[PDB]
Amino acid sequence: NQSSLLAEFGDPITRVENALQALREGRGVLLLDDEDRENEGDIIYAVESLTTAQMALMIRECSGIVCLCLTEAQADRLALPPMVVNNNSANQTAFTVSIEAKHGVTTGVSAQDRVTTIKTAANPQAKPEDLARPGHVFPLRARAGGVLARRGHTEGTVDLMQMAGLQPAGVLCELTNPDGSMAKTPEIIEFGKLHNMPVLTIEDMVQYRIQFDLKL
Ligand X SMILES: O=C(NO)[C@H](O)[C@H](O)COP(=O)(O)O
| Among its own copies, Zn ion, ligand X, none, partner that 76 touches (CB below 5 to 8 angstroms by kind) | Zn ion
181 binds, among Zn ion, its own copies, ligand X, none (CB under 5 to 8 A by kind): its own copies
Q: In the range 101-130, which residues lie near Zn ion by CB under 5 A?
A: 107
SS3 152: coil
Helix extents (H) in the chain: 2-6, 12-24, 52-61, 72-77, 111-122, 153-164, 185-195, 202-211
Q: Cβ contacts of residue 72 below 8 Å, gap of 6+?
A: 141, 142, 144
Q: Is 38 in the site for ligand X (CB under 6 A)?
A: yes
Whether the CB-CB separation of 169 and 161 falls below 8 Å is answered with yes
Rounded to an integer, what distance in angstroms lies between the CA atom of residue 121 and that of residue 137?
Answer: 10
Rule CB under 8 A: say whether 133 interacts with its own copies: yes
**Residue of closest CB approach to ligand X:** 152
* CA gap 92, 10 in Å, rounded: 32
> Which region, judged by CB under 6 A, interacts with ligand X, from 7-15, 70-78, 146-154, 178-186?
146-154
Write down the least CB distance from residue 2 to its own copies, Å.
17
Q: Which residues, listed in sequence order, are joined to residue 62 by a DSSP beta bridge?
A: 175
Name which of ligand X, Zn ion, its own copies, none residue 36 binds, using a CB cut-off of 5 to 8 Å depending on partner kind: none
What sign has the CA pseudo-torsion 185, 190, 70, 98?
Answer: negative
Q: How far apart are CA 49 and CA 93, in angstroms?
A: 25
Residue 8 assigned ligand-binding role: no
Considering CB under 6 A, how many residues would be counted as binding ligand X? 14
The mark string for 76-115 relative to its own copies (x by CB under 8 A, - otherwise) is -------xx--xxxxx-x-x-xx-x-x---xxxxxxx---
Q: Are strands 41-46 and 29-32 parallel, antiparallel or unpaired?
A: antiparallel
9 secondary structure, DSSP code: G
- Interface residues with its own copies (CB under 8 A) are 38, 40, 52-53, 55-56, 59-60, 62-66, 83-84, 87-91, 93, 95, 97-98, 100, 102, 106-112, 132-136, 174, 176, 178-182
Annotated binding site for D-ribulose 5-phosphate: 37-38, 42, 150-154, 174
Q: Return binding residues for Mg(2+).
A: 38, 153
| Site residues, ligand X (CB under 6 A) | 33, 38, 42, 65, 67, 91, 93, 136, 140, 152-154, 172, 174
